[PDB]
Design a protein around this ligand. Structure first.
Ligand SMILES: [Cl-]
Ligand code: NA
Length: 129
């Protein structure tokens, strides 16, 4: 599924991401835009063998099991295919674990380079929340 901007903002609010660990809703919408272009089915292969999955591009070396990343962990205890669903429950629950790991939203390279230090409120402007 390709989400619209305000549609995704509403869904992440219903799933408890607004102000989770201190990160306002616009941060999460900005990260999804530059990681996946709002597409739940996005996949990208990395230059270490691992693969990133889903709307928040969660990586198979640490967070999910895809059966082809040797020596990796499965810290969210999920098959990576669960992260491609039109329902974002699995992506949200795993993202909550990632952002609590110590480095906050800096775990997402696109957030640190394209969202951090910008007016992220703009990403939820005009939405009915
Ligand atoms: Cl933080
Ligand atoms: Na893994």
């Amino acid at each position: 599924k390709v989400f619209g901007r305000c549609e995704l903002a509403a869904a992440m609010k219903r799933h408890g991401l607004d102000n989770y660990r201190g990160y306002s809703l616009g941060n999460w919408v900005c990260a999804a835009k530059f990681e996946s272009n709002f597409n739940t089915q996005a996949t990208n292969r990395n230059t270490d063998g691992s693969t990133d999955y889903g709307i928040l591009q969660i990586n198979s070396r640490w967070w999910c099991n895809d059966g082809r990343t040797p020596g990796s962990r499965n810290l969210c205890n999920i098959p990576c295919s669960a992260l491609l669903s039109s329902d974002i429950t699995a992506s949200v629950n795993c993202a909550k674990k990632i952002v609590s790991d110590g480095n906050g939203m800096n775990a997402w390279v696109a957030w640190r380079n394209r969202c951090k230090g910008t007016d992220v409120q703009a990403w939820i402007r005009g939405c009915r929340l």
